[PDB]
Design a protein around this motif. Structure first.
Motif, short mmCIF file in Angstrom:
data_model
loop_
_atom_site.label_atom_id
_atom_site.label_comp_id
_atom_site.label_asym_id
_atom_site.label_seq_id
_atom_site.Cartn_x
_atom_site.Cartn_y
_atom_site.Cartn_z
N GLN A 627 -6.18 1.41 0.98
CA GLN A 627 -7.09 0.35 0.36
C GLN A 627 -8.52 0.46 1.11
O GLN A 627 -9.42 0.40 0.54
N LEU B 69 -12.52 -7.41 -4.50
CA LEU B 69 -11.98 -6.72 -3.43
C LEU B 69 -10.86 -7.45 -2.44
O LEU B 69 -9.75 -6.63 -2.08
N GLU B 72 -7.68 -7.31 -4.77
CA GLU B 72 -7.16 -6.12 -4.30
C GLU B 72 -6.34 -6.02 -3.06
O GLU B 72 -5.15 -5.48 -3.10
N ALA B 73 -6.92 -6.73 -2.21
CA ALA B 73 -6.38 -6.81 -0.83
C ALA B 73 -4.98 -7.53 -0.62
O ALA B 73 -4.08 -7.16 -0.12
N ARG B 91 -10.57 -0.41 -8.71
CA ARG B 91 -11.07 1.01 -9.51
C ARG B 91 -10.57 0.79 -11.07
O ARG B 91 -10.97 1.58 -11.76
#
Ligand SMILES: CCCCCCCCCCCCCCCCCC(=O)OC[C@H](COP(=O)([O-])OCC[N+](C)(C)C)OC(=O)CCCCCCCCCCCCCCCCC
Ligand SMILES: CCCCCCCCCCCCCCCCCC(=O)OC[C@H](COP(=O)([O-])OCC[N+](C)(C)C)OC(=O)CCCCCCCCCCCCCCCCC
Ligand SMILES: CCCCCCCCCCCO[C@@H]1O[C@H](CO)[C@@H](O[C@H]2O[C@H](CO)[C@@H](O)[C@H](O)[C@H]2O)[C@H](O)[C@H]1O
Ligand SMILES: CCCCCCCCCCCO[C@@H]1O[C@H](CO)[C@@H](O[C@H]2O[C@H](CO)[C@@H](O)[C@H](O)[C@H]2O)[C@H](O)[C@H]1O
Ligand SMILES: CCCCCCCCCCCO[C@@H]1O[C@H](CO)[C@@H](O[C@H]2O[C@H](CO)[C@@H](O)[C@H](O)[C@H]2O)[C@H](O)[C@H]1O
Ligand SMILES: CCCCCCCCCCCO[C@@H]1O[C@H](CO)[C@@H](O[C@H]2O[C@H](CO)[C@@H](O)[C@H](O)[C@H]2O)[C@H](O)[C@H]1O
Ligand SMILES: CCCCCCCCCCCO[C@@H]1O[C@H](CO)[C@@H](O[C@H]2O[C@H](CO)[C@@H](O)[C@H](O)[C@H]2O)[C@H](O)[C@H]1O
Ligand SMILES: CCCCCCCCCCCO[C@@H]1O[C@H](CO)[C@@H](O[C@H]2O[C@H](CO)[C@@H](O)[C@H](O)[C@H]2O)[C@H](O)[C@H]1O
Ligand SMILES: CCCCCCCCCCCO[C@@H]1O[C@H](CO)[C@@H](O[C@H]2O[C@H](CO)[C@@H](O)[C@H](O)[C@H]2O)[C@H](O)[C@H]1O
Ligand SMILES: CCCCCCCCCCCO[C@@H]1O[C@H](CO)[C@@H](O[C@H]2O[C@H](CO)[C@@H](O)[C@H](O)[C@H]2O)[C@H](O)[C@H]1O
Ligand SMILES: CCCCCCCCCCCO[C@@H]1O[C@H](CO)[C@@H](O[C@H]2O[C@H](CO)[C@@H](O)[C@H](O)[C@H]2O)[C@H](O)[C@H]1O
Ligand SMILES: CCCCCCCCCCCO[C@@H]1O[C@H](CO)[C@@H](O[C@H]2O[C@H](CO)[C@@H](O)[C@H](O)[C@H]2O)[C@H](O)[C@H]1O
Ligand SMILES: [Ca+2]
Ligand SMILES: [Ca+2]
Ligand SMILES: [Ca+2]
Ligand SMILES: [Ca+2]
Ligand SMILES: [Ca+2]
Ligand SMILES: [Ca+2]
Lengths: 629, 629
Positions: A627, B69, B72-73, B91
């Motif tokens: 990531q 983001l 995503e984390a 992505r």
């Protein structure tokens, strides 16, 4: 043409040449051309007029890079250099312990035969609608070739080869004929896969877990110490000890299956079993084409055909039990009639006849239940095994313990209970050891002598060490899983733990059996059967629930045998309504303490849990570093 | 400087400027510079002489790409376009449902505040050995900044902000003040996270699962139908219905937690809890530096200090029970003495006094157990929660049901059992609804009126809608997890199901409570407390075992109440030794049928299991395609 043969495929007799060349072209061809990239060979490059009846045996092996890529495809879990069990990949192959670029000792012969069986299983048809040369072999895209070749009767059997120089070095350290000896579970694993090693580890554990029961219960029955404790200390010790051994087996099994790697192997997706037929359609889960069966038809075929047959078989087992009790009353009257010398030996005859009839009816029901569960069209193999285990466990529990329950809770005669329990346990164990391993070993020795004398009268320049071995192992018996071998231990635990209060000596009758069975089953794996294919297994499976259910039923049975003895009834001679309440309170306290002991002790040990947490944290850190970049 | 504030951080009063600039430089700085990349702002750009006492509140938000983001984390599981729940990545962000490049409605405010709390939590120190400006703040590499700022008393509280225009549109469809109405669990989820929504879904389920018990048990008590069935049909219906609802809750919870995605979120590795202190050392699992504590010291601090305190508190609860029974005998003698008119109301007074003393002693033991479990230095939060749940559950079970067990099984007086059970249940529920939500709502209304009248007398050009909101929510109460709110339902199920044979009407006394509690707890989340941080949860947790243990204990309690009534004793008037055997056989058959019902029904439903199998097969196919290339 000079490789080491690992897997033998035996074709049928009436097999045309076009199917043989098509199978040979689908085996040798590379992985990008839709093949399997395995080295293929006939058994003999030349044939004479004598050996024309053995013209269908073929040998399959491969090269070292092929076996390493197949180990990457299967997902073997090997030990890295930093004392960690990781999955095997060919790009990261240098991290693993004991691996060279020129080492043929990394993957053992059991793992190599498992990889070759997995590559023959994952040999699917894409373009072909039928097998070339056979009309009825209906092939759809996504169907395994070996499964359709086995079901349509073209490939007779696919079996791995015994290694006659590594089996002897296992047998030298396996047969504990002298005295007590720790069983070599790691060498058993490296030769036979993990399922057979888990069974032999469970048998070695269960032998060393009935030794406190036999040692405590041997002066408890001879010196009769039932006067002092009045069945409270010994029953509590038996039930707490059964819970403790059934939890410490889970701890030891987690330790063993981490030490081999099968605790970390992922669950492979299961193909439909060989004999599941439906209508061709779209599979909802995978999206490919598969046979589909409506679930209501399967539930009807269970709950209207199988369950009445199971109820009819339980009623027939009760009817044979009543015939045995009429025979027992007739033999007691004959003992009252005739004399004294020959009329004491006559009381042990009908229980022996009943034990032989039990061991016949169990095999007849086993054939009937295998046919009736292969008829319900189960999709996976796990569901078929669970249904077969349920049917066979229910009937074998009823058929083995129905006469002892009728003696203990209806007749209430403890002398006949001791005699019948000892005779049933000893005769069933002796007939089990005779029909299981010893008589098939004698028949296998006779067949091996006959095959040797046939091979020695030859007229060709045949290297006899391979052809003779393949001809001998062609006609051996196959291993039908570790189901009967756990069922024998389940019935041993039933005979020991259900009536350990009124007869603890029977626990010793298990240990003196297991000291032979550790040898005997070993002989059954060594000189009787073919080599089984290696199967990874992380636990004993559904047998943990069966052993825990036996240990729960034995609480109620032991307390009901406490509340019927003349020892405990002397405490409450006039008020038999407080005795039942105290026995039921002790029974519920023992069930609560048993469930508290099963919930308090963790299943995996401490260091295995730390190693699994480290293996999870390394993958989480790999995800975080993916990531972050 | 014009963003939307999401998280408020309140600093302390005596905080130097260097620590403020260092925290502001560690918040705004980018992810590659060791920061968190969050938009930071003071509450007010200017300050006057009146608002100098509120100079420590700061606002934290971020931009949209930062929140994506951070999602995503964290690992949010969102719905793809092909009706599949997959993890969110930046992505592959175009595959998800309802997502645009210009849409601020994708991530809700609860998910945004959870992402900002996770990014403030994962703000670690690398170079700094201490906090700049504070000597005693011992900082090691790998230690979270916010945890050390909270424990050392620099950051007072970190709390998310209520949305006053989305809370009103939730409140319009939440308060079912008119009649029966299905609770909007998805909007509760989108505003409050998944744990609060799982609690309100469990309360909505448990309300609609005691309605058959209340509807069957209302003419069963009024018309007394105990003559016809003799307590066999109704008790079996209650116990089978409790097992059925405790399994169908697991099915509905699997369905709900697949519908939100928290069934598929991976288990995040747990940091040591805020208040676990040991010696600095190398963590064995992760390999980083952490506080370590020897396990034998923790086991000594439990099994020599906590367990004697729990036993002393159970003895004190029994002593208060005996004081209540002496008061009951004194009130019965006073009723025998004085008269008729005022001496029937006098029998309901000591049970009300005992209910108030129970609800005082439970809170005192809750404070003592929180202190005694925060003293044992538990490492994770799950272990601390499990130990606290065990202590509070054991004492609350004993302290609530000890008087009813002493009436039912020692005095054996069913009229006093009905009176005491109804009075204890009604008074405890009324005092629970008063001290839980209504009185804190009245105090919060008074405090809000006072804060409003303080803010309206201002002397600055302050945009009041934000500063007024932050000042009002600074002094609100925080939500201490969903532990008391499940404990109330556990004690309701205890009062209903333990003595449903002798008093089924109490089941109705649960439903008429829950029709308020669905409102009342909702008010407790809306106008009483701060906004809780969103926490993903896949199940209710250890409460399933507690509810199943209650449903197992109630089998023995219901059968012991069957075997003491004058209805069943008329069947066996002379032989009270067959009555106990028949009741114990019915009890064991009910326990066996309950465990068979709990084992037979699957935990996850059919389509959820098919979707998880498809999600596993797609990852296995991705692994196979990675292997093939
Ligand atoms: C006296 C006799 C009765 C007591 C004997 C007790 C002996 C010990 C039994 C131990 C438990 C064995 C569990 C095996 C197992 O997994 O079974 C579940 C298996 C599991 O099948 P499955 O794989 O489809 O289910 C998986 C789903 N879970 C795990 C949630 C259950 O159940 C079945 O196969 C159902 C078959 C139903 C029809 C059976 C007909 C024959 C038996 C009739 C019994 C009743 C009349 C007598
Ligand atoms: C009458 C009173 C007794 C009966 C009351 C029954 C009420 C319902 C209880 C439902 C079960 C609750 C389970 C909670 C839980 O997870 O606990 C396990 C937790 C789990 O802790 P853990 O997280 O370390 O364990 C995880 C490992 N497994 C899952 C294998 C258990 O156990 C403990 O916390 C152990 C604490 C031991 C010391 C407790 C002292 C106070 C209590 C004394 C009880 C005995 C004297 C009385
Ligand atoms: C009536 C009272 C009965 C009390 C019974 C108490 C039992 C305690 C646990 C007994 C088994 O204890 C277990 O022993 C093995 C070694 O044999 C250890 O390994 C394991 O960590 C430990 O958990
Ligand atoms: C109470 C219960 C007791 C159970 C005892 C079980 C074990 C009994 C037999 C132990 C010795 O087992 C014995 O091993 C030898 C090899 O050394 C086997 O011999 C076999 O393999 C060897 C080696 O390739 C060949 O030379 C030989 O011709 C062949 O018969 C034999 O078939 C087997 O029978
Ligand atoms: C899970 C439930 C567990 C329940 C356990 C207890 C169940 C049975 C309890 C009652 C049986 O207990 C007892 O049994 C014996 C038969 O063995 C009965 O009869 C016998 O008692 C004694 C037994 O040495 C003799 O002196 C007597 O002549 C004979 O009649 C007795 O009347 C009964 O009182
Ligand atoms: C979770 C709940 C756990 C506990 C539940 C079960 C509690 C059951 C308690 C029963 C106590 O009730 C107890 O019953 C027995 C009969 O069985 C009574 O016994 C008396 O009556 C019986 C019947 O006429 C006589 O045979 C006996 O000699 C006499 O002592 C005793 O005086 C009473 O005290
Ligand atoms: C009512 C009295 C009941 C007493 C029951 C006693 C049970 C003891 C259970 C604790 C001992 O089990 C212990 O568990 C820890 C993990 O927590 C293991 O580590 C350890 O190897 C094992 O031995
Ligand atoms: C004494 C004999 C008692 C027999 C009890 C039989 C219970 C059967 C199962 C009852 C619950 O049945 C369940 O109902 C829900 C809808 O409410 C279904 O969904 C679920 O698939 C089904 O499993
Ligand atoms: C039997 C049990 C019955 C339990 C009933 C529980 C619910 C009772 C109150 C229901 C209405 O709830 C009520 O909603 C209004 C908003 O519409 C809240 O009002 C609050 O927010 C609004 C909107 O920002 C502001 O204009 C107002 O000044 C402020 O007080 C009020 O504080 C709350 O009390
Ligand atoms: C898990 C174990 C479950 C066990 C369930 C049964 C436990 C108790 C069984 C014995 C109690 O059953 C019965 O209880 C009553 C008190 O309520 C006792 O006494 C009472 O009986 C009837 C009750 O209307 C009255 O006529 C009589 O005057 C009085 O003495 C009786 O002697 C006992 O026979
Ligand atoms: C898994 C095993 C499942 C079953 C286990 C439990 C089985 C228990 C069976 C007990 C049968 O034993 C049964 O005991 C009762 C007493 O309790 C006996 O009852 C007799 O004696 C008692 C005691 O003197 C008298 O009070 C009573 O009026 C009389 O009928 C009955 O005649 C006998 O038949
Ligand atoms: C002794 C007689 C006991 C009878 C017990 C009956 C239990 C019935 C269990 C089977 C019904 O449960 C059913 O399980 C299937 C999966 O197998 C689910 O699909 C279905 O939704 C559920 O309804
Ligand atoms: Ca045997
Ligand atoms: Ca065997
Ligand atoms: Ca356990
Ligand atoms: Ca309440
Ligand atoms: Ca509540
Ligand atoms: Ca289940």
């Amino acid at each position: 043409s000079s490789f080491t043969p690992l897997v033998v495929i035996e074709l049928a007799q009436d097999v045309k040449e076009e199917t043989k060349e098509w199978l040979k072209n689908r085996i040798i061809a590379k992985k990008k051309d839709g093949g399997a990239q395995l080295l293929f060979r006939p058994l003999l490059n030349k044939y004479e007029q004598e050996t024309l009846e053995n013209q269908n045996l073929y040998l399959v092996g491969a090269s070292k890079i092929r076996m390493l890529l197949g180990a990457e495809a299967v997902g073997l879990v090997k030990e890295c250099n930093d004392n960690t069990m990781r999955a095997f990949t060919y790009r990261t192959r240098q991290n693993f312990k004991g691996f060279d670029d020129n080492n043929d000792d990394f993957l053992t012969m059991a793992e190599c035969q498992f990889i070759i069986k997995h590559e023959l299983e994952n040999l699917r048809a894409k373009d072909e609608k039928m097998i070339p040369g056979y009309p009825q072999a209906k092939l759809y895209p996504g169907k395994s070739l070996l499964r359709r070749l086995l079901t349509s009767g073209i490939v007779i059997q696919v079996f791995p080869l015994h290694d006659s120089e590594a089996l002897k070095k296992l047998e030298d350290t396996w047969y504990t004929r002298f005295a007590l000896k720790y069983q070599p579970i790691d060498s058993i694993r490296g030769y036979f896969g993990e399922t057979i090693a888990l069974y032999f580890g469970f048998l070695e554990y269960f032998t060393f877990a009935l030794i406190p029961m036999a040692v405590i219960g041997l002066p408890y029955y001879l010196f009769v110490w039932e006067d002092y404790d009045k069945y409270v200390i010994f029953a509590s010790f038996n039930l707490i000890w059964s819970t403790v051994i059934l939890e410490l087996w889970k701890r030891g099994c987690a330790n063993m299956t981490y030490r081999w790697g099968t605790l970390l192997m992922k669950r492979k997706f299961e193909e439909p079993r060989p004999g599941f037929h439906g209508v061709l359609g779209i599979n909802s889960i995978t999206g490919k084409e598969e046979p589909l069966y409506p679930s209501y038809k399967r539930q009807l075929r269970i709950y209207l055909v199988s369950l009445p047959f199971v109820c009819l078989c339980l009623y027939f087992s009760l009817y044979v039990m009543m015939i045995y009790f009429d025979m027992e009353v007739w033999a007691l009257g004959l003992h009252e009639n005739s004399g004294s010398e020959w009329t004491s030996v006559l009381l042990y005859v009908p229980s022996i006849i009943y034990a032989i009839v039990i061991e016949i009816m169990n095999r007849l029901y086993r054939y009937a239940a295998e046919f009736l569960t292969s008829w319900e069209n189960h999709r996976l193999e796990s569901a078929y095994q669970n249904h077969l285990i349920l049917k066979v466990l229910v009937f074998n529990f009823l058929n083995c313990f129905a006469s002892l329950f009728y003696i203990a809770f209806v007749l209430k005669d403890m002398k006949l209970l001791r005699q019948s329990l000892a005779t049933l346990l000893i005769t069933s164990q002796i007939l089990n050891q005779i029909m299981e391993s010893f008589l098939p070993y004698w028949l296998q020795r006779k067949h091996g002598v006959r095959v040797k004398r046939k091979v020695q009268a030859l007229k060709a320049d045949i290297d006899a060490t391979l052809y003779e071995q393949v001809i001998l192992e062609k006609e051996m018996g196959t291993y039908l899983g570790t189901f009967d071998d756990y069922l024998e231990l389940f019935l041993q635990f039933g005979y020991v733990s259900l009536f350990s209060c009124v007869y603890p000596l029977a626990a010793a009758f298990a240990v003196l059996n297991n000291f032979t069975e550790v040898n005997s089953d070993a002989l059954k794996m060594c000189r009787v059967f073919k080599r089984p294919f290696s199967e990874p297994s992380a636990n004993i499976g559904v047998w943990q629930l069966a052993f825990e259910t036996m240990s729960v039923i034995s609480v109620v049975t032991n307390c009901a045998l406490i509340g019927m003895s003349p020892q405990v009834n002397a405490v409450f001679p006039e008020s038999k309504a407080d005795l039942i309440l105290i026995v039921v309170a002790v029974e519920h306290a023992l069930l609560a303490l048993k469930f508290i002991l099963a919930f308090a002790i963790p299943d995996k040990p401490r260091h295995i849990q730390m190693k699994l947490a480290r293996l999870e944290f390394e993958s989480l850190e790999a995800l975080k570093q993916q990531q972050m970049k």
